[PDB]
Design a protein around this ligand. Structure first.
Ligand SMILES: C[C@H]1CC2(CN1C(=O)Nc1ccc3c(c1)CNC3)CC(F)(F)C2
Lengths: 156, 39
């Protein structure tokens, strides 16, 4: 089916009507999304089938039709844009300065933007339009709002 | 079965809505890929 580069919605007909469970990026013939969106299940694109190729529950990432292609990184200084694709709503760019997740294994950028369930997998971009990571895996703070890590894979 | 639908091009938009703060949080990541706040 459709293999043009871009951001895509991940939909299902299992629940009531058509429900958006997440979002993903098509780049170089590979579909990239978060593991918790599909749970590693196969995908449909028109009449064509997309089979999982690589995945990891701890990184919360999965790739279809080929190895993970996204390798751009946040520079640790500049503002970034979340290309949010909420359920039933138009794709929208939101610019923000990321904070930081400090872990025992190093620091990771983090975006303090809150969207509904079904927005996970929306890409985070740098000023050149390169995907520096996917939005949708993070933490819930005091107020009840979300702060997502900038989750990036490794290009082998 | 899950299916995909195109939603747009991946481009930086000039004069986009600028929002959100930049918090520095100490976090832990478990084997199931879940983050938690360390305090
Ligand atoms: C609480 C909402 C808020 C959220 C992301 N959320 C999640 O629950 N993420 C999530 C769920 C299951 C797993 C993981 C992460 C990693 N391990 C399994 C929707 C959003 F994308 F808009 C921002």
């Amino acid at each position: 089916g459709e293999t043009t580069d871009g951001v895509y919605r991940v939909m299902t007909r299992r629940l009531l009507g058509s429900t958006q469970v997440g979002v993903g990026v098509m780049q170089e013939g590979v579909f990239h999304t978060m593991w918790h969106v599909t749970k590693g299940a196969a995908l449909r694109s028109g009449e064509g089938r997309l089979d999982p190729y690589w995945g990891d529950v701890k990184q919360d990432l999965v790739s279809y039709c080929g190895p993970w292609k996204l390798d751009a990184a946040w520079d640790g200084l500049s503002e970034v844009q979340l290309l949010a694709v909420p359920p039933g709503e138009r794709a929208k760019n939101i610019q923000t300065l990321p904070g930081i997740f400090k872990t025992k294994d190093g620091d990771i950028g983090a975006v303090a933007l809150d969207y509904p369930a079904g927005t996970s997998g929306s890409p985070i971009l740098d000023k050149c339009g390169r995907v520096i990571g996917l939005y949708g895996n993070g933490v819930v703070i005091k107020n009840g709002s979300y702060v997502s890590a900038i989750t990036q894979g490794k290009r082998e | 079965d899950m299916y995909i639908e195109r939603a747009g091009d991946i481009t930086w938009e000039k004069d986009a809505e600028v929002t959100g703060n930049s918090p520095r949080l100490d976090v832990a990541l478990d084997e199931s890929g879940d983050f938690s706040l360390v305090e």
